[PDB]
């Protein structure tokens, strides 16, 4: 059975939303993607509210710039960096320079073989496969 992440997902302020343009942090071929959905129990919203995702969340993306074969296909990605500041459960406030996602399978397996740049711990702790490829964890 595949390695278990943490059973908890503390509240995070969402940084990316529907129709956001987010660069990719890996070498899977995609360069830029458009966010078109959020997956999981936290994805349900109310009237007029646009769903959002924070670090560690899984979203549905469409490849906009990248390899010609990969373009216009629908994938799943994990948010690993977020410009929107957010407060960890121990009261620590965090902010990154840039937004970024990692393209993964629906089960959480990364597409590319290497992740560029730093990765939020909440991404690493919820998805152990992402932890195995992240060189820097903050």
Partner 1 sequence: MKIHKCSFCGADIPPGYGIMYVRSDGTVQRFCSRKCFVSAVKYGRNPRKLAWVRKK
Partner 2 sequence: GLKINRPRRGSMGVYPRKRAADIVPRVRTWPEVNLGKPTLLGFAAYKAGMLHAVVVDDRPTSPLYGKEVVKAVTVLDAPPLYVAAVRLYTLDPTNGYKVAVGEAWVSEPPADLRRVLTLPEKFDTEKQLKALEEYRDVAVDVRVLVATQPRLSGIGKKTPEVLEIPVGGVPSIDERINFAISLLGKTVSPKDVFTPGQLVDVIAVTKGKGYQGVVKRFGVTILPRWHKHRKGHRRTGTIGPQAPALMFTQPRPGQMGFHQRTEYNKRILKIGDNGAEITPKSGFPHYGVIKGPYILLQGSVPGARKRLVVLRYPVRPPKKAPPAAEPQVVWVSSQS
Give the list of residues 6+ apart from residue 40 with CB closer than 8 angstroms, or none. 9, 57, 58
Tokens standing for 102?
């990692």
Least separation in angstroms between CB 76 and partner 2: 25
Chain contacts with partner 2 (rule: CB under 8 A): 6, 8, 46-48, 89-92
CA atoms of 69 and 120, how far apart (whole Å): 29
Residue 72 interacts with which of RNA, partner 1, partner 2, none, CB < 5 to 8 Å by class: RNA
Shortest gap between Cβ of 123 and partner 1 (angstroms)? 13
Nearer to RNA, 21 or 135 (CB): 21
Q: How far is CA 130 from CA 35, 47, 75, 109, in A?
A: 19, 34, 16, 8
Which residues, 37 to 56, sit near RNA by CB under 7 A? 37-52
Cα dihedral value 50, 106, 40, 79, nearest 10? -60
- Give the interface with RNA as residue ranges (CB under 7 A): 1, 4-5, 7-13, 17-19, 34, 36-52, 60, 62, 64, 72, 74, 76, 85, 87, 91, 93
């Amino acid at each position: 059975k595949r390695t278990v992440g943490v059973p908890y997902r503390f509240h995070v302020t969402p940084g990316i939303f529907m129709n956001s343009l987010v660069p990719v942090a890996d070498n899977s071929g995609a360069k830029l993607v458009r966010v078109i959905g959020v997956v999981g129990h936290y994805s349900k919203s109310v009237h007029r509210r646009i769903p959002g995702a924070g670090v560690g969340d899984m979203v549905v993306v469409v490849v906009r710039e990248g390899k010609p074969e990969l373009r216009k296909q629908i994938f799943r990605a994990i948010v690993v960096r977020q410009r929107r500041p957010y407060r960890r459960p121990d009261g620590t406030w965090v902010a990154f320079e840039d937004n970024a996602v990692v393209i993964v399978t629906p089960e959480g397996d990364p597409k590319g073989s290497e992740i560029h740049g730093p990765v939020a711990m909440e991404a690493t702790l919820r998805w152990p496969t992402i932890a195995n490829l992240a060189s820097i964890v903050v």
